Amino acid sequence: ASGMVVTDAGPDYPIIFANRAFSAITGYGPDEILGRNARFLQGPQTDWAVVARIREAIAAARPIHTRLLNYRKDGQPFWSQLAISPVRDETEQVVAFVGLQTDVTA
Amino acid sequence: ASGMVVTDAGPDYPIIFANRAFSAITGYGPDEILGRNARFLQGPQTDWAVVARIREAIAAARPIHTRLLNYRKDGQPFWSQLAISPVRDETEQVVAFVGLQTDVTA
Ligand SMILES: Cc1cc2nc3c(=O)[nH]c(=O)nc-3n(C[C@H](O)[C@H](O)[C@H](O)COP(=O)(O)O)c2cc1C
Ligand SMILES: Cc1cc2nc3c(=O)[nH]c(=O)nc-3n(C[C@H](O)[C@H](O)[C@H](O)COP(=O)(O)O)c2cc1C
């Protein structure tokens, strides 16, 4: 299965749920994930222009599909195919985000 | 906050995440929610025609926004404004659902 997380909405977007597949892909257990913004997976060779695109998509509540370099707990880089989408309530306000992580490393 | 759950997709759709607001609205703790299909909230005066529309929408991966009578743990009925949406993966397969529960009792 792909990794999946749920976050709160802004301004902090902490992770409130992470599936077991996300822990397998990233090397972090739930206690090392919950309450953190997902940017902790980024590292020195992550493309900061893609990170900025992600930031802007989330701020505008626009779904985004893109590929980003992330790092396992042990420091190994991997390619994450990310899909990040808002969850809206009865008045169309954004109350959470869902993220899917697919390890697309060849 | 509205209640929010995440479920797996078919054929069983068990709940894999429930927020604190869902436990406050329904009166059930997380230990008594996780692993269950959300239909446990229904009871004797729930409209079985609306339940069927929800079943059909989920089976077709169509979002549905509707109002349904549900029951708190203590037996008190309440009106739940339900919003149930699929989560799609990189090849557009449905891999989860998100549900929002807004208590709209007068
Ligand atoms: C639901 C969700 C899931 C996310 N998953 C990841 C992820 O797996 N890897 C990642 O590098 N960033 C992920 N992000 C993006 C970061 O949380 C953050 O939005 C990004 O780094 C841009 O914001 P910043 O410039 O403040 O860091 C996710 C964000 C959300 C809302
Ligand atoms: C994400 C999600 C959330 C749901 N939330 C509720 C809910 O709060 N209350 C409810 O009565 N049914 C809820 N349902 C609907 C039931 O799980 C089920 O789909 C419905 O009873 C129709 O199927 P059935 O005829 O097999 O019971 C939810 C379903 C999903 C997928």
UniProtKB/TrEMBL annotation, chains A, B:
Domain PAC: 62-106
Location(s) in or outside the cell: Cell inner membrane
Ranges where the PAS domain occurs: 1-61
Protein residues bound to FMN: 37, 39, 42, 55, 70, 101
Protein name stated in the entry: histidine kinase
Organism the protein comes from: Chloroflexus islandicus
Full-protein interval shown: 48 to 153 of 913
